[PDB]
Design a protein around this ligand. Structure first.
Ligand code: WC9
Ligand code: K
Ligand code: MG
Ligand code: MG
Ligand code: MG
Ligand code: MG
Ligand code: MG
Ligand code: MG
Ligand code: MG
Ligand code: MG
Ligand code: MG
Ligand code: MG
Ligand code: MG
Ligand code: MG
Ligand code: MG
Ligand code: MG
Ligand code: MG
Ligand code: MG
Ligand code: MG
Ligand code: MG
Ligand code: MG
Ligand code: MG
Ligand code: MG
Ligand code: MG
Ligand code: MG
Ligand code: MG
Ligand code: MG
Ligand code: MG
Ligand code: MG
Ligand code: MG
Ligand code: MG
Ligand code: MG
Ligand code: MG
Ligand code: MG
Ligand code: MG
Ligand code: MG
Ligand code: MG
Ligand code: MG
Ligand code: MG
Ligand code: MG
Ligand code: MG
Ligand code: MG
Ligand code: MG
Ligand code: MG
Ligand code: MG
Ligand code: MG
Ligand code: MG
Ligand code: MG
Ligand code: MG
Ligand code: MG
Ligand code: MG
Ligand code: MG
Ligand code: MG
Ligand code: MG
Ligand code: MG
Ligand code: MG
Ligand code: MG
Ligand code: MG
Ligand code: MG
Ligand code: MG
Ligand code: MG
Ligand code: MG
Ligand code: MG
Ligand code: MG
Ligand code: MG
Ligand code: MG
Ligand code: MG
Ligand code: MG
Ligand code: MG
Ligand code: MG
Ligand code: MG
Ligand code: MG
Ligand code: MG
Ligand code: MG
Ligand code: MG
Ligand code: MG
Ligand code: MG
Ligand code: MG
Ligand code: MG
Ligand code: MG
Ligand code: MG
Ligand code: MG
Ligand code: MG
Ligand code: MG
Ligand code: MG
Ligand code: MG
Ligand code: MG
Ligand code: MG
Ligand code: MG
Ligand code: MG
Ligand code: MG
Ligand code: MG
Ligand code: MG
Ligand code: MG
Ligand code: MG
Ligand code: MG
Ligand code: MG
Ligand code: MG
Ligand code: MG
Ligand code: MG
Ligand code: MG
Ligand code: MG
Ligand code: MG
Ligand code: MG
Ligand code: MG
Ligand code: MG
Ligand code: MG
Ligand code: MG
Ligand code: MG
Ligand code: MG
Ligand code: MG
Ligand code: MG
Ligand code: MG
Ligand code: MG
Ligand code: MG
Ligand code: MG
Ligand code: MG
Ligand code: MG
Ligand code: MG
Ligand code: MG
Ligand code: MG
Ligand code: MG
Ligand code: MG
Ligand code: MG
Ligand code: MG
Ligand code: MG
Ligand code: MG
Ligand code: MG
Ligand code: MG
Ligand code: MG
Ligand code: MG
Ligand code: MG
Ligand code: MG
Ligand code: MG
Ligand code: MG
Ligand code: MG
Ligand code: MG
Ligand code: MG
Ligand code: MG
Ligand code: MG
Ligand code: MG
Ligand code: MG
Ligand code: MG
Ligand code: MG
Ligand code: MG
Ligand code: MG
Ligand code: MG
Ligand code: MG
Ligand code: MG
Ligand code: MG
Ligand code: MG
Ligand code: MG
Ligand code: MG
Ligand code: MG
Ligand code: MG
Ligand code: MG
Ligand code: MG
Ligand code: MG
Ligand code: MG
Ligand code: MG
Ligand code: MG
Ligand code: MG
Ligand code: MG
Ligand code: MG
Ligand code: MG
Ligand code: MG
Ligand code: MG
Ligand code: MG
Ligand code: MG
Ligand code: MG
Ligand code: MG
Ligand code: MG
Ligand code: MG
Ligand code: MG
Ligand code: MG
Ligand code: MG
Ligand code: MG
Ligand code: MG
Ligand code: MG
Ligand code: MG
Ligand code: MG
Ligand code: MG
Ligand code: MG
Ligand code: MG
Ligand code: MG
Ligand code: MG
Ligand code: MG
Ligand code: MG
Ligand code: MG
Ligand code: MG
Ligand code: MG
Ligand code: MG
Ligand code: MG
Ligand code: MG
Ligand code: MG
Ligand code: MG
Ligand code: MG
Ligand code: MG
Ligand code: MG
Ligand code: MG
Ligand code: MG
Ligand code: MG
Ligand code: MG
Ligand code: MG
Ligand code: MG
Ligand code: MG
Ligand code: MG
Ligand code: MG
Ligand code: MG
Ligand code: MG
Ligand code: MG
Ligand code: MG
Ligand code: MG
Ligand code: MG
Ligand code: MG
Ligand code: MG
Ligand code: MG
Ligand code: MG
Ligand code: MG
Ligand code: MG
Ligand code: MG
Ligand code: MG
Ligand code: MG
Ligand code: MG
Ligand code: MG
Ligand code: MG
Ligand code: MG
Ligand code: MG
Ligand code: MG
Ligand code: MG
Ligand code: MG
Ligand code: MG
Ligand code: MG
Ligand code: MG
Ligand code: MG
Ligand code: MG
Ligand code: MG
Ligand code: MG
Ligand code: MG
Ligand code: MG
Ligand code: MG
Ligand code: MG
Ligand code: MG
Ligand code: MG
Ligand code: MG
Ligand code: MG
Ligand code: MG
Ligand code: MG
Ligand code: MG
Ligand code: MG
Ligand code: MG
Ligand code: MG
Ligand code: MG
Ligand code: MG
Ligand code: MG
Lengths: 275, 48
RNA sequence: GAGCUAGCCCUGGCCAGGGUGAAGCUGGGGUGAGACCCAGUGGAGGCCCGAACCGGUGGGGGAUGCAAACCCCUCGGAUGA
RNA sequence: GAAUGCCGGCAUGAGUAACGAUAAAGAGGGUGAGAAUCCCUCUCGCCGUAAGCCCAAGGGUUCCUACGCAAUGGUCGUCAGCGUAGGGUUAGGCGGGACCUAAGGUGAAGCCGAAAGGCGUAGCCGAAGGGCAGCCGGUUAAUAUUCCGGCCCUUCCCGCAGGUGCGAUGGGGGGACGCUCUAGGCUAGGGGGACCGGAGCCAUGGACGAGCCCGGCCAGAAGCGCAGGGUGGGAGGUAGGCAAAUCCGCCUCCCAACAAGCUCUGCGUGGUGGGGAAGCCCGGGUGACAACCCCCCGAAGCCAGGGAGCCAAGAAAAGCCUCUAAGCACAACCUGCGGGAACCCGUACCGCAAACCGACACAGGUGGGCGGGUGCAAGAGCACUCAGGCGCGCGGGAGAACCCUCGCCAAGGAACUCUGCAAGUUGGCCCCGUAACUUCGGGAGAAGGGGUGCUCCCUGGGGUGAUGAGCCCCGGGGAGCCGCAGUGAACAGGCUCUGGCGACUGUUUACCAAAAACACAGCUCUCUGCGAACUCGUAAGAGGAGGUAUAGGGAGCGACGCUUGCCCGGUGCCGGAAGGUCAAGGGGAGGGGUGCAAGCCCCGAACCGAAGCCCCGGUGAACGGCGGCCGUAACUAUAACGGUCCUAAGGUAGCGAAAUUCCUUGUCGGGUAAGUUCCGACCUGCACGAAAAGCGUAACGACCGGAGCGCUGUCUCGGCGAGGGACCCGGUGAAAUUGAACUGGCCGUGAAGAUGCGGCCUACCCGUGGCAGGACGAAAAGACCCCGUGGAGCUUUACUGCAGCC
RNA sequence: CGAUGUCGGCUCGUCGCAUCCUGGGGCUGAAGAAGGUCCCAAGGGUUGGGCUGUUCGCCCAUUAAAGCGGCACGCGAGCUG
RNA sequence: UGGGAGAGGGUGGUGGAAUUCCCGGAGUAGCGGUGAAAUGCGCAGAUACCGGGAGGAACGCCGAUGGCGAAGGCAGCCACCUGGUCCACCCGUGACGCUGAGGCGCGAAAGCGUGGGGAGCAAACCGGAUUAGAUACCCGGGUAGUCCACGCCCUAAACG
RNA sequence: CCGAGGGUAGGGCCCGUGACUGGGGCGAAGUCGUAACAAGGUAGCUGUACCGGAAGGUGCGGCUGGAU
C-alpha cells in the first residue's frame, strides 16, 4: 500500500513512500549489525568502476542468514519484522528456541509470533526452508540456493519468487523471477513463499534529491558529452546517434548479447528469459 | 581569493618527507640525485 | 604533483528571525456501515520572506589596478541534490 | 652596428602618474641636532555580530626592556613587526604521547607480477571521533587552569584492615550514535529597584530630590535540597553466544511495576577563599569594615544516553561491568584507609591580520567559540552607543575644464535607446480586499486601498507571584494634541497584460557565455541466472554487491495530459544443426632431388576440416527513410475523382512565414497618429512532424520577445550644488616607449595617404593647463586569408596495425 | 599580414555643387494664383516621431525646405558595441 | 414455525475435452486455403501419427418453448459466506400501507488508469485475391483488446 | 455625521461587432462512388472503438424492427 502526498510542493505531487505497515521494530538487533563500508563505486585502485555512485544515507549492514541449513530441526519464533536499508525486501527477526537470533528476508504473509523451521522434514509453510527435492511441484519459493551449501542466490528482492516446475534426476526445474527455466540441484535449499514488500515496484521517487538519498549520483547521457568522452559525443546542435547506439566503451547497447558463449552453466539452463 | 599554497605541516611531511621518498623506487632516486648534486637539504624542512 | 581545482571515503561543525500550515490525531456532523464535510490540535516541505554562509544577474568603477578577476550598487540560493 | 640577439651599465618619458579604501582631524605641553608624523593631555570623528575578546591552523622571536636610525617604512621619524644587546615560554589534572579504533595506510599467513613491484585476512599505524583526573583569585616589564594562595581530584607502587572463587588479548553487556520538532526544571546572559554601599555634584531659568552619577558579586569538598538521566527482582529449565561459564540469549513461574529502590549527572545551598565601581590623588593609592539584597526576562547552553514524529533507517574499538579458561587459591582480586611515586613534547608573540595564503606593512582569501544596551513587530537585520579598539605611514593650499561617487531641478514624461540600459517609483507591520486559469496545492504580497506619532481616561487575556501588588508579554475602546510630513532617521517589492523556451528546486564554461545548455523524477528499448553482465588491472585482486531480475549495467527520451502513424530492400543486432566459401591441421592421387641400393629429403591433386562472411528469416522508443508528371465538376477558380511512371514505403494525427519561411517587411486582422518587432489568423511547410519525440499544459525563471499603467535627468536640455581627484607649494618619485632629430600648412611628387622631396605659403625663443585629427601613434613577429610534402584534437564503410572478443 | 580596427549609431564638424529651400533670371502648351523646364547662385538654412542593429527605405505629424555627395563608405589613443 | 426449487451474488479450490507452442520418437512431398486461386508454410524435414511438457481461455452432452435475478445479467465440479423467493400451518404485531421530485447504490459491450496475464480470437495494421477502383466483403499474417486485481467511465434496439 | 455625484481600482451579467474558422438549412437538370429499401446482392439496426475521399468498413457486445 504505497502512500501518496498532497501537492503542497512540486515534488510532493508525485512522490510516493512505502507504508511500512508490516514493520514492528524500528531499531536493529545490535548483535547482528556491522558497518557497511561505502565504496562510491571505487575499487581497491581508487578508480571509479561503476559510475554515478556515492553520497547516499549512512547505513548499517544487517547480517542475513542465507543458509538456514545451519540449524536443521530447531524451530524459531518470528519476533519482529524490520526495515533493512541494504535490500528491497523487509527482514524478519528470528528467535530460535536455542536462544540464537538471526535475520532472514521476510516472505509475503509471514506473521509475527508464528514459527518457522528448516530441514527435509519441515512442513510446507510460508517461512520454512527445505532442500528443493522435498518441496512439492508447483510450490512458489524464494531465497533459492543455486548450488548446494553455497547460500541463497536466487529470488531475494521484494516481491519476487521462483516456482518449482518438475523434477529430473537430482535436479528440480525452476521458473526464475526473470522467466528463465533452469535446473537447480535438488539438495539446494529454498524457502516456501514469495518475498514480501511486493508494492516496492510502485514507489515513485518524486524528485532528484530522492535519488541522491539512495546514493545515486546524476547520470549523464552520452549524447550530452564530447567525442573524447563517448561515441555519442559531439555534433553541432543536437544529434541523433549517427551510428549503432553504443556504450562509453564502444560496444553496442541495443540487442548485442553478452553472456559468455561456452559457459558450463549453459547445460543447466533450459529456456532463456522471455518478455 | 584563495591562492594555491595553503601550508600544512602534516601534509608537507607525509608527501615530500624523507620516509615518503625512501618507500618508493622513484623517491630513492630523488634522494640519490639530490645527494649527488650536493643539496644542503634533501627534503623540505617542516617543524614537525 | 589533488596543500589549487573535480569527484568520492572517514570524522566533526554551521544555517538569526519571521511566514505558510500537509498528513495524522481529537471532537462534531454524516451513513446500515462508509466515503466524506467542519472545527480544533498538529508541524510536513529539493515550501515562502530574509541575515550569517554559499553564490555571481544587470550596471557603473577599475584597466602600468587595492587586485595576474578586485570594489560599489543591484541580484540568486539560504532544511538541502 | 643591427640577430624584438646575450649580460651589464646608464639614459628618455619627468620632477611627470602615483604615494593603496573619502572613518577626520585640531590645539597645548614634552623630548630631540632635527618633529604635521614619537610621548602625554584636552577637543573632534570611526568600528562596536567589530575594525572588540578568546581558540585552532599557518608563521617562528615578530614577545619584554635598554641603546640606536644607514638601510627597510610608499613622506617624516627622535618612532617601529627595523639594527645591536640582555631578558622572557615553568603542568600528574590544559593539548598530544606512554590508551582506543575511522576512512585510509601498512601488512606474519597467503596470492600475483620480466625486474622494479602489485595485492592481501589478522595484526599494526592512523583523529579535530571515543576515553581520561582543576576550579577561583593573586603575582611579572614579559608565563601562568603551568608559579603562588585557597579548596578539590586521578593513576601507579607498597603496606594495614575488611570482603570475595580470584584469574583473559577469550564469551557477554555496555560504550553506541540519524533528521526535524519538542516538555519540565535550571544555568549563562540581560533589564529594573523608592532597597543597600559610595567620592562627589546643584551649573545657565528651575530642582537639595523617592535628585544625578557609580557599584550591588565570583569559586567552593562532604552533607542536604530541587530537577533529570540509567536500571526490573527472584527461581527452575537450557541443546545457542566456534573451549568453559553461575554471565548473555531463549522458555516457564513468582513478586515488584504511571512508582519504588539503587546508581549517575546538572543546578542550588554549603566550611572556606576571593573579588569589589564612579570620583579623587600620584599602572598605583584611596573610596571601603565597600555594599554585596529584592523583582522581572531568559537561552540555541545544562540535566541528557530526555520525549514525540518521520524515512533516506542513522561508525568502530578501548576504558568500564559481568562471565568463566588455563592457572592459582601462603596467591590474586574487590572495598576502605595510610605512606610513597607520577616521565616525554607544546606553552613567548601575531592570529579576518602590517606577523597566516596572495612577490608588497597588498581594499582580496582564512575554520570554531563570546559577541553587551536602546528603539525599530522579530532578529546575528538597521541606526546610535558600552567594554574595548581605531582615524586606515605623505602633507599644506586652491575652489578651473574634465572624471568619479553623491544631492536637487521649472514644463514635459521614454519624446532616450539595440533595450526604460541606468536611475526613479514601490517598499516594514496591522486591517480591508483580491481576477483569468488551475494539477485544487496554487496563481497571491495578485491587483487596489485604509491605518501607523504623541497625550489623558477606560479596559481584555497570557506569563511570574499568591488567587493580590509589582514586574512582563500581546492587545482593545473612547476622547484629544501637533506638524508639510507619525515604519517622521536607517534597514525593507514597482505593478499588470501577452507570447517563445525549459515542467519544477538544482548544475555549468575558476578568470568574456548561467542559458533555451547539463541534471532531474518519469517513460521505453536492451544486456545480465550470479565466479552475473559491465568496469579498472599484464596478473593476483577489486568495484558491481556482502546486492540477485520489484536487482545490476548500457542507451535514448525528459514532470504531467492526449498521443507516437507507414517502410525491414541497404547497415546494425537477433534467430537459423541446410547449402556456398573458408586457415592451421588431417589426407597423399601423383610427381621431384640425391644415393649402387636400402634410404634420406622436397613438392603435392581430390577429399575431411571452426569462427567469420555469403545465404534464409526477424526486428524501429535499432542506424535510418517516409515520391513525380498529366487530366477532371453546368460562370470562373479549385479539384472530392482519374491516368501513368517510380519506390522498401511514399509524412498519419497534431502543428505551421515557426528559436525552422529563402522569395519576405508574404497576406489579412489586432494593437499605434505611424508597428521590418509583437500577437491572432491563412497555408505554394525554399527546408515542421511524432521518444535526436509531436501538440498542449497550472506553477516556476536574475532566461529571450511584445504592450500598458505608475515614476523618473533616459531624453527635449541642460543648470546648480557636495565630496575624492585633476591644479599650485613642501616631501618621496615610477612606466610602457625611444635609429637619431634642428619634428609647420597647402598643392603636387614619390613603393600608389610626406614634418624630412619640389614649388609656394606661413612661422620670433621657451614653457604651463587642456583636446585627441596626424606621427599609416603604443602593448602583441595577424588569431582572418593563403603557403609549409609544419603540428596537434576529433571522425569514419581512408590505410595499416594493436588491445579486446570469437 | 614583427596588425593601415571592420557595419550602424552618438558627438563634432568641414568641404564640393550635379541646388532641397530662400535670392536673381530666360522660355513656357506663363490670364491671375500655382506649376513645369533651363540658367546664375554654396550666404545661411535643411524639423520631431513609429518600425528595424540597420545604412537605406516605408509610414505619422509638420515644414520655406525636409538636397545629394567627399573627407580611410570623415570621426572606437573621442564614446557606443 | 416447518419445508422447498433455482446458471441469484461473492471468495477460495479444482476437473476433463480441445487449440497453440516446446521436447522426443516415427515418417516423406507436400500441407494450407478458396467460388476458383494466390499470399503463407514445407527436404534447414512441413502436413498427417504416437508419447512427454508448458500455458491461457472457455465449460460439450445434460440443456429445454427450462430455471434464477429489480435490471444489467448468470452455465463443468466442489466447499464456505450471502440475497431474493414460493408453499404449508393460521401462531405473533395491529394499517405499521402504496408511490416516490431530489439523494444513494447497481448498471452488457466497448473505452480509460496502475499492475499482472496472453493459448485461442482479433479493431488498427501488412500482405494475397477480387474489382474500373476495393482504404471492403473472401484468404494468409497481426497489435491493442478480449482474461485477473483494484480504481474509473455510466452508454445501448439497457426491448415486452 | 450623513449625503447627489465626481474620481481611482477591480470584478459580474448582457448586447453589438471581428481577420479567420465549424458545421447547418435551402437552391429545375454539376463531379465521385452505390451505403440503405428485395436476403438490396456482406440481413439490417445498434452503444462503443479504430480506420478510410465519401457514403461507409471492421472489432466487441446487444436488438429483431431479419429472410429463407
Ligand atoms: C571585413 C573585415 C573582416 C576586414 C578586416 C577588418 C578587421 O581588421 C582590419 C583588417 C585589416 N587589418 C585590420 C586589423 O588587423 N585589425 C585588427 C585590430 O586589432 C585591434 S582592434 C580590435 C580587433 C579588431 C581588428 C583586428 C583584426 C587593434 O587595436 C588594431 O590596431 C588592429 O590590429 C580588415
Ligand atoms: K573566419
Ligand atoms: Mg504524492
Ligand atoms: Mg489533491
Ligand atoms: Mg513494510
Ligand atoms: Mg558490536
Ligand atoms: Mg585496499
Ligand atoms: Mg559503470
Ligand atoms: Mg561512482
Ligand atoms: Mg539491492
Ligand atoms: Mg526493507
Ligand atoms: Mg546446481
Ligand atoms: Mg520502478
Ligand atoms: Mg540510501
Ligand atoms: Mg541524463
Ligand atoms: Mg553533446
Ligand atoms: Mg557539448
Ligand atoms: Mg580525457
Ligand atoms: Mg579517439
Ligand atoms: Mg570515439
Ligand atoms: Mg554522434
Ligand atoms: Mg551535440
Ligand atoms: Mg541541426
Ligand atoms: Mg552540442
Ligand atoms: Mg545519422
Ligand atoms: Mg556504434
Ligand atoms: Mg535468461
Ligand atoms: Mg578557490
Ligand atoms: Mg587546504
Ligand atoms: Mg598539520
Ligand atoms: Mg593537521
Ligand atoms: Mg594533511
Ligand atoms: Mg602518500
Ligand atoms: Mg614522509
Ligand atoms: Mg628499485
Ligand atoms: Mg634500489
Ligand atoms: Mg650543510
Ligand atoms: Mg625531496
Ligand atoms: Mg606522486
Ligand atoms: Mg584539496
Ligand atoms: Mg588534505
Ligand atoms: Mg538555512
Ligand atoms: Mg528560526
Ligand atoms: Mg505576513
Ligand atoms: Mg500526533
Ligand atoms: Mg526553501
Ligand atoms: Mg512570504
Ligand atoms: Mg560582478
Ligand atoms: Mg542597475
Ligand atoms: Mg583585468
Ligand atoms: Mg565586490
Ligand atoms: Mg550591495
Ligand atoms: Mg530567500
Ligand atoms: Mg531559513
Ligand atoms: Mg651588418
Ligand atoms: Mg644589439
Ligand atoms: Mg620588443
Ligand atoms: Mg635572437
Ligand atoms: Mg639582453
Ligand atoms: Mg639583460
Ligand atoms: Mg656590474
Ligand atoms: Mg641593463
Ligand atoms: Mg640604472
Ligand atoms: Mg639624455
Ligand atoms: Mg627625471
Ligand atoms: Mg606628460
Ligand atoms: Mg601611475
Ligand atoms: Mg597607486
Ligand atoms: Mg568603504
Ligand atoms: Mg565613498
Ligand atoms: Mg584645536
Ligand atoms: Mg595636529
Ligand atoms: Mg615628526
Ligand atoms: Mg624630524
Ligand atoms: Mg596622521
Ligand atoms: Mg602619542
Ligand atoms: Mg582644549
Ligand atoms: Mg551591538
Ligand atoms: Mg613567514
Ligand atoms: Mg632609518
Ligand atoms: Mg631616516
Ligand atoms: Mg649603525
Ligand atoms: Mg625606506
Ligand atoms: Mg608601501
Ligand atoms: Mg634624538
Ligand atoms: Mg617574553
Ligand atoms: Mg599542576
Ligand atoms: Mg612508561
Ligand atoms: Mg591500535
Ligand atoms: Mg609485467
Ligand atoms: Mg612486495
Ligand atoms: Mg599512519
Ligand atoms: Mg594509535
Ligand atoms: Mg584523540
Ligand atoms: Mg586530558
Ligand atoms: Mg575541580
Ligand atoms: Mg592566572
Ligand atoms: Mg567481590
Ligand atoms: Mg545502541
Ligand atoms: Mg550501532
Ligand atoms: Mg559517533
Ligand atoms: Mg530523514
Ligand atoms: Mg552558576
Ligand atoms: Mg533582557
Ligand atoms: Mg556555588
Ligand atoms: Mg548451555
Ligand atoms: Mg554528561
Ligand atoms: Mg582599606
Ligand atoms: Mg548552536
Ligand atoms: Mg544530550
Ligand atoms: Mg532519545
Ligand atoms: Mg573495525
Ligand atoms: Mg587446573
Ligand atoms: Mg596457598
Ligand atoms: Mg618512558
Ligand atoms: Mg603560556
Ligand atoms: Mg577579511
Ligand atoms: Mg574568526
Ligand atoms: Mg597586526
Ligand atoms: Mg599601510
Ligand atoms: Mg590586507
Ligand atoms: Mg550592558
Ligand atoms: Mg524590525
Ligand atoms: Mg585618515
Ligand atoms: Mg578601515
Ligand atoms: Mg593613507
Ligand atoms: Mg587651484
Ligand atoms: Mg531642496
Ligand atoms: Mg524635472
Ligand atoms: Mg508616462
Ligand atoms: Mg505621467
Ligand atoms: Mg519604448
Ligand atoms: Mg541587451
Ligand atoms: Mg523590450
Ligand atoms: Mg527608490
Ligand atoms: Mg524604504
Ligand atoms: Mg483578469
Ligand atoms: Mg481568483
Ligand atoms: Mg492573467
Ligand atoms: Mg493561463
Ligand atoms: Mg483553485
Ligand atoms: Mg498590498
Ligand atoms: Mg487609526
Ligand atoms: Mg510628537
Ligand atoms: Mg521585498
Ligand atoms: Mg529550468
Ligand atoms: Mg535549461
Ligand atoms: Mg517542452
Ligand atoms: Mg511540461
Ligand atoms: Mg522535466
Ligand atoms: Mg533551492
Ligand atoms: Mg528554491
Ligand atoms: Mg572561459
Ligand atoms: Mg566564465
Ligand atoms: Mg582563465
Ligand atoms: Mg561577466
Ligand atoms: Mg552560454
Ligand atoms: Mg540563473
Ligand atoms: Mg551545461
Ligand atoms: Mg526538467
Ligand atoms: Mg514522461
Ligand atoms: Mg519499463
Ligand atoms: Mg581494461
Ligand atoms: Mg563493497
Ligand atoms: Mg562485497
Ligand atoms: Mg540502471
Ligand atoms: Mg536533460
Ligand atoms: Mg490539461
Ligand atoms: Mg529497414
Ligand atoms: Mg529484413
Ligand atoms: Mg534489416
Ligand atoms: Mg540519413
Ligand atoms: Mg536507406
Ligand atoms: Mg493516425
Ligand atoms: Mg506559414
Ligand atoms: Mg508576417
Ligand atoms: Mg510553430
Ligand atoms: Mg524549415
Ligand atoms: Mg521571412
Ligand atoms: Mg528574411
Ligand atoms: Mg509590413
Ligand atoms: Mg492595424
Ligand atoms: Mg502568428
Ligand atoms: Mg501560401
Ligand atoms: Mg533519433
Ligand atoms: Mg533536431
Ligand atoms: Mg509547443
Ligand atoms: Mg504554463
Ligand atoms: Mg529558471
Ligand atoms: Mg533564469
Ligand atoms: Mg513597456
Ligand atoms: Mg544628466
Ligand atoms: Mg567639488
Ligand atoms: Mg605657483
Ligand atoms: Mg621634492
Ligand atoms: Mg639625426
Ligand atoms: Mg638634430
Ligand atoms: Mg617641435
Ligand atoms: Mg611647427
Ligand atoms: Mg597613384
Ligand atoms: Mg602627399
Ligand atoms: Mg615641412
Ligand atoms: Mg629627407
Ligand atoms: Mg632636408
Ligand atoms: Mg631631391
Ligand atoms: Mg623640401
Ligand atoms: Mg619646399
Ligand atoms: Mg600656408
Ligand atoms: Mg605643471
Ligand atoms: Mg599639459
Ligand atoms: Mg592625436
Ligand atoms: Mg583619436
Ligand atoms: Mg607602420
Ligand atoms: Mg592617429
Ligand atoms: Mg593611427
Ligand atoms: Mg595583447
Ligand atoms: Mg607573422
Ligand atoms: Mg601573433
Ligand atoms: Mg590570403
Ligand atoms: Mg603531400
Ligand atoms: Mg612542397
Ligand atoms: Mg602537415
Ligand atoms: Mg597525432
Ligand atoms: Mg601490442
Ligand atoms: Mg564485451
Ligand atoms: Mg594586413
Ligand atoms: Mg612592432
Ligand atoms: Mg596589418
Ligand atoms: Mg542618442
Ligand atoms: Mg492658367
Ligand atoms: Mg548655400
Ligand atoms: Mg531606420
Ligand atoms: Mg553603409
Ligand atoms: Mg531596408
Ligand atoms: Mg512653397
Ligand atoms: Mg556624405
Ligand atoms: Mg567606397
Ligand atoms: Mg564597401
Ligand atoms: Mg569610424
Ligand atoms: Mg573602442
Ligand atoms: Mg564605430
Ligand atoms: Mg587608435
Ligand atoms: Mg589612431
Ligand atoms: Mg537434407
Ligand atoms: Mg505461456
Ligand atoms: Mg393468528
Ligand atoms: Mg458499466
Ligand atoms: Mg495479441
Ligand atoms: Mg429483447
Ligand atoms: Mg460633482
Ligand atoms: Mg451494408
Ligand atoms: Mg445496395
Ligand atoms: Mg446490405
Ligand atoms: Mg454490394
Ligand atoms: Mg478496415
Amino acid at each position: 500500500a504505497v502512500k501518496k502526498f498532497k501537492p503542497y510542493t512540486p515534488s510532493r505531487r508525485f512522490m510516493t513512500v512505502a507504508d511500512f505497515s508490516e514493520i514492528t521494530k524500528t531499531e536493529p538487533e545490535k548483535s547482528l549489525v556491522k558497518p557497511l563500508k561505502k565504496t562510491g563505486g571505487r575499487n581497491n585502485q581508487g578508480r571509479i568502476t561503476v559510475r554515478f555512485r556515492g553520497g547516499g544515507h549512512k547505513r548499517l549492514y544487517r547480517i542475513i542468514d542465507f543458509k538456514r541449513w545451519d540449524k536443521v530441526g530447531i524451530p524459531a519464533k518470528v519476533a519482529a519484522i524490520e526495515y533493512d536499508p541494504n535490500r528491497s525486501a523487509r527482514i524478519a527477526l528470528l528467535h530460535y528456541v536455542d536462544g540464537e537470533k538471526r535475520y532472514i528476508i521476510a516472505p509475503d504473509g509471514l506473521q509475527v509470533g508464528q514459527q518457522v523451521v528448516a530441514g527435509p522434514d519441515a512442513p510446507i509453510q510460508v517461512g520454512n526452508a527445505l532442500p528443493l527435492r522435498f518441496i512439492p511441484v508447483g510450490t512458489v519459493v524464494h531465497a533459492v540456493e543455486l548450488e548446494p551449501k553455497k547460500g541463497a542466490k536466487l529470488a531475494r528482492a521484494a516481491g519476487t519468487s521462483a516456482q518449482i516446475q518438475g523434477r529430473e534426476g537430482d535436479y528440480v526445474i525452476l521458473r526464475l523471477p526473470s522467466g528463465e527455466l533452469r535446473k537447480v540441484h535438488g539438495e539446494c535449499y529454498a524457502t516456501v513463499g514469495a518475498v514480501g514488500n511486493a508494492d516496492h515496484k510502485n514507489i515513485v521517487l518524486g524528485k532528484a534529491g530522492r535519488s541522491r538519498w539512495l546514493g545515486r549520483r546524476p547520470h549523464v547521457r552520452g549524447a550530452a558529452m564530447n567525442p573524447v568522452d563517448h561515441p555519442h559525443g559531439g555534433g553541432e546542435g543536437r544529434a541523433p546517434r549517427g551510428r549503432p547506439p553504443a556504450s562509453p566503451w564502444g560496444w553496442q547497447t541495443k540487442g548485442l548479447k553478452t553472456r559468455k558463449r561456452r559457459k558450463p552453466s549453459s547445460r543447466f539452463i533450459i529456456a532463456r528469459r522471455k518478455k | 581569493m584563495k591562492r594555491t599554497w595553503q601550508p600544512n605541516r602534516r601534509k608537507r611531511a607525509k608527501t615530500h618527507g624523507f620516509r615518503a621518498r625512501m618507500r618508493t623506487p622513484g623517491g630513492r632516486k630523488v634522494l640519490k640525485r639530490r645527494r649527488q648534486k650536493g643539496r644542503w637539504r634533501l627534503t623540505p624542512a617542516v617543524r614537525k
